[PDB]
Design a protein around this ligand. Sequence first.
Ligand SMILES: FC(F)(F)[C@@H]1CCNCCN1
Length: 284
Amino acid sequence: MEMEKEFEQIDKSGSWAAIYQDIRHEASDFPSRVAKLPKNKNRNRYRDVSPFDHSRIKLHQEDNDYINASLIKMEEAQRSYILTQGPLPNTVGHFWEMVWEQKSRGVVMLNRVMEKGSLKCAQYWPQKEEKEMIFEDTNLKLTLISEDIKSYYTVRQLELENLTTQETREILHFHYTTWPDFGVPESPASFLNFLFKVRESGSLSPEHGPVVVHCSAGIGRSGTFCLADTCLLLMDKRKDPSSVDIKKVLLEMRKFRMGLIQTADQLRFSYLAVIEGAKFIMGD
Ligand SMILES: FC(F)(F)[C@@H]1CCNCCN1
């Protein structure tokens, strides 16, 4: 069923809450035993948000291999994403270690460091060229190279150095800065513009490791980003784009990380973004 028609039908009936709860009821349930070990309590921002054991990213060290991060692998779309929480004061070094080990080109950030008067994630990147950051626990150095500030999003060029081998790589930081403190954006136009800037960079492409995507918990806004991307890619590959069922794509993605899309308003916004984006490239 064409999703645009399904959209108007849910909107006229006002059943967004009922559709959303059916998703929550059908979603996969897999064990998260590593996340709940007592040695890992200060590695988790939220007690109710854990990576499944089968899909979790492992750090390459014998000490403790645990990070709150999952590999979302879409088989038919041929895209991989890492979804993670906003780093904590004691996990900033783990975060950059993961970026290095997985060969990521891009980091996508969908939150501000402070929202609603509270800290949502650590200041994990340098703000001035001449004041670089050293993570002594993981032996990495991070330098700000350049910064391009726009109305809806900032792009930064960073240099990550493995202090052990003296290899360096360029990492692109894509920071969406205007998601509101409450609710979802009224129009998906600036979110879709941001997604197409990440794509154009090469960060989502198979010659690199998976893109690292985060918000505060790594399930809500982060979920919106990868669901919209995958749905538009499927519409460009399939003989009939109207076959693309966003609820079925979301359930597949929820086999890899719990809780993706946190509210009925985030679900509605995901439909809006896919419907509008399909036009962006629909003999347009
Ligand atoms: F679930 C499905 F709708 F069947 C597809 C197919 C495969 N790729 C990821 C999600 N979409």
